[PDB]
Amino acid sequence: EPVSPLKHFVLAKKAITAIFDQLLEFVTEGSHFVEATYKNPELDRIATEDDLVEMQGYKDKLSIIGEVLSRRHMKVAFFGRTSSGKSSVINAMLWDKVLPSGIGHITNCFLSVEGTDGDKAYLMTEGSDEKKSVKTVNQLAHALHMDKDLKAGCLVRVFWPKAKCALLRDDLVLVDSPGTDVTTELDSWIDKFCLDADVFVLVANSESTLMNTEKHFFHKVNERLSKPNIFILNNRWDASASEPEYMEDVRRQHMERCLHFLVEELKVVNALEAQNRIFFVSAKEVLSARKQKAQGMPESGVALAEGFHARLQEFQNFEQIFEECISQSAVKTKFEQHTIRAKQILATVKNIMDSVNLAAEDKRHYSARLPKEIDQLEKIQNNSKLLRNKAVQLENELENFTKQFLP
């Protein structure tokens, strides 16, 4: 029963979409009503031109906002020097080899993974919204390899069936980035598809020490952002588990190094909470465990070194902590503004209804005679009352969404 914390975001996205669809209806049901009280000739000064323009203009806005919402997702970007393991991590999070990840696999560019509803994967390049079909991680690798023309820094969106890993179902986009030791100007290309990530992951190789280039990059990032969500995965941990003599000291030296980094060098986090961003893991091992667990075979011969379970736990710990983290942050970052933008539309749509109801009441009160005419004044006054009562119900739904998902 994996209640993956990403579902908090799937839930919120569902809720704010439901409210916005009701709202599109409410303003179109409303525009149809303001279009009719305006066109009526036996009804003057009741519906103003400054109210008909907004009631059609909101109808336009809300359609486009619905489009923007239906696209929002969670975006996590990975970074680190070449062959640290970035592609091995991602594939392990997806329980299969989605991205290529050998030695010498093309690394010159960004590769994102994200889900499609079909059973056929596919691919997209820059400048072309053609969907280039992609049949397997093998032919994806052999294709990239042959592209000598493939631009440096460019973006390649992979679309992988949501029914292969859960992570892709639950609206999460994962982004692999050019090796941070062979590019020099990666801090320039990050503005295209990575500066707006919710969570960044430094995939540090734990057979080494954190080189300045990796740290220098996150600097230039953290300079432009506001307390970004930075995780460090000292990957390849198994390497040092083959020699227990030094395991305590080796870890304590990395763990002190990463701790001092986030806490003191990046100042993005304090020590107490840093302990839930630095993990020691083995992507190659996690991916081997999973890619076998799905096929049916039991947990046999996956551990290349002793300590495999301790390591797997720490990874599952990372996935847990990270998932929770990205969904809380992204729900706020990507929805709190549309929520505020609806409270304003509602607040003015309904006071348009109040001014329509209020005029029609004062028309029947001081300027009305005909049985046929005053019977229109009552159906306009009742409809405006009914629609304004819809607005208040939507205002409550939004108060409720904000209460559940937006403290």
Are 186 and 178 within 8 A, CB to CB? Answer: yes
Candidates 18, 182, 310, 347: give the one binding its own copies (CB under 8 A).
182
Neighbouring C-beta atoms of residue 305, cutoff 10 Å: 15
Of 45, 50, 116, residue with least CA distance to 368: 45
Is the Cβ of residue 187 or residue 285 nearer to ligand GDP in the bound state? 285
Question: What is the C-alpha separation between 387 and 37, in angstroms, rounded?
Answer: 14
Of these partners, its own copies, ligand GDP, none, which one is at the site of residue 339 (CB under 5 to 8 Å by kind)? none
Stretch touching its own copies by CB under 8 A, among 27-35, 187-195, 221-229, 237-245: 237-245
Are 282 and 234 within 8 A, CB to CB? Answer: no
Residue ranges that bind ligand GDP, judged by CB under 6 A: 82-88, 101, 103-105, 107, 179, 207, 235-236, 238-239, 242, 282-285, 304
Regarding 57 and contact with its own copies (CB under 8 A), the answer is no
Of these partners, ligand GDP, its own copies, none, which one is at the site of residue 182 (CB under 5 to 8 Å by kind)? its own copies
Is the Cβ of residue 111 or residue 173 nearer to ligand GDP in the bound state? 111
Candidates 88, 91, 112, 206: give the one binding its own copies (CB under 8 A).
206
Burial, 247: exposed, middle or buried (Cβ in 10 Å; 0-12, 13-18, 19+)? middle
Question: What is the C-alpha separation between 299 and 318, in angstroms, rounded?
Answer: 21
Are 231 and 279 within 8 A, CB to CB? Answer: yes
Instruction: Compute the least distance from the CB of residue 280 to ligand GDP, in Å.
Output: 10
Of 296, 308, 216, 202, residue with least CA distance to 258: 202
Of these partners, its own copies, ligand GDP, none, which one is at the site of residue 145 (CB under 5 to 8 Å by kind)? its own copies
Is the Cβ of residue 14 or residue 216 nearer to its own copies in the bound state? 216
Stretch touching its own copies by CB under 8 A, among 32-40, 59-67, 138-146, 342-350: 138-146
Stretch touching its own copies by CB under 8 A, among 58-66, 128-136, 245-253, 309-317: 245-253
Regarding 249 and contact with its own copies (CB under 8 A), the answer is yes
Instruction: Compute the least distance from the CB of residue 22 to ligand GDP, in Å.
Output: 45
Residue 337: partners with Cβ closer than 8 Å, 6 or more residues away: none
Instruction: Compute the least distance from the CB of residue 181 to ligand GDP, in Å.
Output: 9
Of 332, 345, 333, residue with least CA distance to 395: 345
Residue 142: partners with Cβ closer than 8 Å, 6 or more residues away: none
Q: Name the token pair of 347.
A: 């607040």
* 60 among annotated binding-site residues: no
Of these partners, ligand GDP, its own copies, none, which one is at the site of residue 307 (CB under 5 to 8 Å by kind)? none
Query: Nearest to ligand GDP by Cβ — which residue?
Result: 88
Question: What is the C-alpha separation between 19 and 14, in angstroms, rounded?
Answer: 9
Q: Name the token pair of 27.
A: 């303003």
Question: What is the C-alpha separation between 180 and 33, in angstroms, rounded?
Answer: 59
Regarding 106 and contact with its own copies (CB under 8 A), the answer is yes
Stretch touching its own copies by CB under 8 A, among 68-76, 80-88, 335-343, 375-383: 80-88
- Residues 361-380 binding its own copies (CB under 8 A) are none
Of these partners, its own copies, ligand GDP, none, which one is at the site of residue 208 (CB under 5 to 8 Å by kind)? its own copies
DSSP 103: S
Candidates 2, 41, 104, 127: give the one binding its own copies (CB under 8 A).
104
Stretch touching its own copies by CB under 8 A, among 115-123, 151-159, 200-208, 367-375: 200-208
**Rounded alpha-carbon distances, angstroms, from residue 366 to 169, 359, 362, 369, 375:** 61, 11, 6, 9, 15
DSSP 264: I
For 134-158, the DSSP string reads: ---HHHHHHHHHH-SS--TT-EEEE
What does the angle CA 64 – CA 67 – CA 68 come to, to the nearest 5 degrees?
A: 90
Of these partners, its own copies, ligand GDP, none, which one is at the site of residue 87 (CB under 5 to 8 Å by kind)? ligand GDP
Residue 383: partners with Cβ closer than 8 Å, 6 or more residues away: 33
Are 273 and 279 within 8 A, CB to CB? Answer: no
Is the Cβ of residue 251 or residue 343 nearer to its own copies in the bound state? 251
- List, as residue ranges, the binding site for GTP: 83-88, 235-238, 282, 284
Instruction: List contacts with its own copies (CB under 8 A).
Output: 81-83, 100-106, 138, 141-142, 145, 181-182, 206-209, 239-240, 242-243, 245-247, 249-250, 253
- List, as residue ranges, the binding site: 83-88, 235-238, 282, 284
